[PDB]
Each structure stands twice: as C-alpha cells, then as structure tokens.
C-alpha cells in the first residue's frame, strides 16, 4: 500500500508543478507582448486587455484540469480502491 | 460482455488466409489470424477501398462522358471545380510536362478523403449490420480502411515506386546514383569528394526511404487515434447512466466536428506532399 500512495504524491507534484511552470512561462510571454503593445499604442490598451484575457482563458484550460485532478488524487485517491 | 472485450473486438480485421488444412478460410479468432503468415488478406479493408474507388471513378466518369463545354450542370460543375483546384495545385509546384502527376493527385486526394469519411458513421452500425446479414455474433469487420497500416503502406509504396521510376527515367541511372553519392556534401578537389560519398549515401538514402514511411504513418496515426477516441466514447454509453450518457453525446459531437476537419486536412497533406515529392524527382534541387 505504501508504493501506491507514495507514487500518488509524486503524481500530484508532477501535475501541478508542470502546470505552474507552463503557465508562468506562457503568461510571461503573453504579458510581455501586451506591455509592448500598451507602450506603443496607449489608446488601444482597453481592447488589448480584453483580447489578452481571451487568450488567457485558452492558456489556462489544461492546467486547471490538471490542478483539479491533482486535488481529486490528494483527497479522493482513486488508486487505493484498485488494490 | 466487458469494456475490454468490446474494445478488443473493434480492433480486429476480417482475415482470409491459409488455415492449418487448406488455403480457403476465415480466421475466427485474433490468434488464428496471427498464425496466418504474410499470405493473408484483410477482406474488409480491400472490399471497402475498392468499392469507394469504383464509386468515385464512376461518379467522375458520369461527368466526363458528357462534358458540355458550355453551361455546366450541377454534377460536372463540382467535377470541374475539383479538377481545376487540383490542376492549380499541380502547376504551382511542378513545371514539367508529365501527364501522370495531375490525375494521380486527383485520385489520391479524392480516394483518401472517401476512405477517411466513413469514420464519421457510428462505430457500431456497420459491424453489427454485417453480423446480422451474415448471421454471426463474433464477426470481425472494420469499415475505415485508413486505420489499417496495410492500406496506407500500399498507398505510399506505390508513390515511392513512382518517385524512383521517374527519377531514373529523367536523370538516367548515372544521375540517380550521383544524386545519392555526390550532391549533398560536394567540393572540387577529388581527394575530398571520395571521402564524402558514404556520408552523402547515408543521408540521401535515409531521406529517400523516410518518405513512404512518413506518408503512410502520419495518415495511419491520425485515423487510428480518431477511431480509437470514437470507440472510447462509446464505452460511456455502455454504463447506462443518465448523467454519463449525456456528457458522452457532447463529447461525441465535438469530436466529430473536429474529426471532419482533420479528415480533410490529412487528404490535402497527402496530395500536396505527393506532388512535391514527385516534382523534386525531375530537377536538380541542389
């Protein structure tokens, strides 16, 4: 029983850690281009912010799925019940 | 039956080959089909590919035996649109006078599109229809021919044979061997060009053999993944629950909407890459 739970902990760590790494890098790129656009065209920033949020919605989908599944693993381990 | 048995049944083909006593019989189990050697046939793959090719050729002949050259009807308007699109695609890559390239591209594109299209029908309709018509309850029957690596490999091996044939025909045997041993890494002083023949041979031979393999395996992987995801969603309906058979419907709809675009893209890629590979069999690109 020790091995299953021990590997579940590492699975949770891999899930949310990889999600965090990916989201941080991707949002760094997206926000950097948003800041460049805002500095060059200060009058268009209200539109750029909305478009950036539309892109951020796509950027965070799989990582939020991973976070939810990691929490499901931590509090409702589905692998202990499979012997 | 179990989910594992349901999935395992959908992955087996209708094989006809040499039984332990006699070269006339259909394998009744997967192991009995594996026991049959190289000399076995997937009857469901061939019977679908030939049928769809014949249907496409008959439909296109119906609009060519009576071409009006004036105001076109509904059918031959579509046929002319397809022919014009293929001709424009060919002329933007191939500059020679070869009369084989364009009809080949048209046949490849339409045939592959038709073969992929039957993946859209529900995965259990045709196998169960075949089982009911034949009278069996364990009949193996796979409809989508492009999920069979044999079909994609047969499509790509003939393209590779055409590539080699036209390369030899237009360059000579000496030109064919020179484009494999001298061109990639070349120089003027003889003492070095002799030390570069094995590197050139290795690189050009790997690139030459990797074309049919990539052409077959890209299409096979895409279609096999699509049909496997279609099969997996059907397991959600097998549970019989209400809140699970409703999410499965939405997943199936979204997957079909994505898969029609994937199906069109795969045929387009195959046609364009065949055109490109045949056009570079005709001139020295280096």
């Amino acid at each position: 029983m020790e091995t299953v739970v021990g590997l579940t902990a590492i699975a949770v760590a891999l899930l949310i850690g990889l999600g965090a790494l990916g989201t941080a890098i991707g949002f760094g790129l997206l926000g950097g281009k948003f800041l460049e656009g805002a500095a060059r065209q200060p009058e268009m920033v209200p539109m750029l912010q909305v478009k950036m949020f539309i892109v951020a919605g796509l950027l965070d989908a799989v990582t939020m799925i991973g976070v939810g599944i990691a929490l499901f693993f931590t509090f409702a381990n589905p692998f202990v019940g499979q012997i | 039956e179990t989910a594992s048995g349901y999935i395992q049944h959908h992955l087996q083909n209708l094989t006809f080959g040499r039984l332990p006593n006699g070269d006339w019989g259909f394998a009744h189990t997967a192991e009995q089909a594996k026991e049959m050697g190289f000399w076995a046939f997937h009857v469901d793959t061939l019977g679908w590919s030939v049928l769809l090719g014949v249907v496409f050729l008959f439909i296109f002949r119906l609009a060519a035996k009576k071409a009006t050259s004036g105001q076109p009807g509904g059918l031959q308007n579509f046929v002319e649109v397809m022919v014009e699109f293929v001709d424009t695609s060919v002329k933007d890559t191939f500059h020679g006078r070869n009369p084989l390239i364009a009809p080949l591209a048209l046949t490849v594109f339409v045939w592959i599109f038709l073969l992929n299209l039957i993946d859209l029908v529900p995965v259990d309709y045709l196998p169960m229809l075949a089982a009911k018509i034949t009278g069996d309850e364990h009949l193996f029957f796979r409809a989508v021919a492009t999920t069979d690596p044999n079909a994609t490999l047969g499509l790509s091996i003939s393209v590779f044979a055409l590539i080699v044939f036209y390369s030899i025909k237009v360059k000579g045997i000496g030109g064919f061997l020179g484009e494999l041993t001298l061109h990639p890494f070349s120089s003027k002083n003889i003492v070095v060009q002799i030390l570069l023949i094995p590197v050139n041979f290795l690189l050009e031979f790997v690139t030459l053999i990797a074309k049919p393999v990539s052409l077959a395996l890209r299409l096979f992987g895409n279609m096999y993944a699509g049909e496997l995801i279609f099969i997996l969603i059907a397991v959600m309906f097998g549970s019989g629950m209400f809140l699970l058979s409703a999410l499965g419907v939405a997943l199936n709809w979204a997957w079909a909407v994505f898969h029609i675009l994937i199906i069109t893209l795969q045929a387009f890629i195959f046609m364009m890459l065949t055109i490109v590979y045949l056009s570079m069999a005709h001139e020295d690109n280096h």
Partner: protein, 47 residues
C-alpha cells in the same frame, strides 16, 4: 446496459451531428457552387 444503450447514444449523437452539418456546412457550399454556375452563365451570355 452495454449494447442497446451504446446504439441509442450513438444514434442521438449522430442525429445531432447531421443536423449541425445540414444547417451550417451545406448552405455555404451550395451557395459557392451556384455562384460559380451563375458567373459561368454570365460569361457565356456576354460572349
């Protein structure tokens, strides 16, 4: 369970997909083909 439920789910999903393709994909294709025919007819009339 299993059979006779998977068939129903597949049929429902397929009918929804067919309705989608009949209401959103078919009309643009028909329109484009008819535009080609009309342009050809106009050219022939001009000739």
């Amino acid at each position: 369970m299993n059979i006779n439920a998977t068939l129903i789910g597949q049929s429902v999903a397929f009918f929804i997909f067919v309705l989608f393709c009949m209401k959103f994909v078919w009309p643009p294709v028909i329109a484009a083909l008819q535009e080609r025919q009309k342009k050809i007819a106009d050219g022939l009339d001009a000739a």
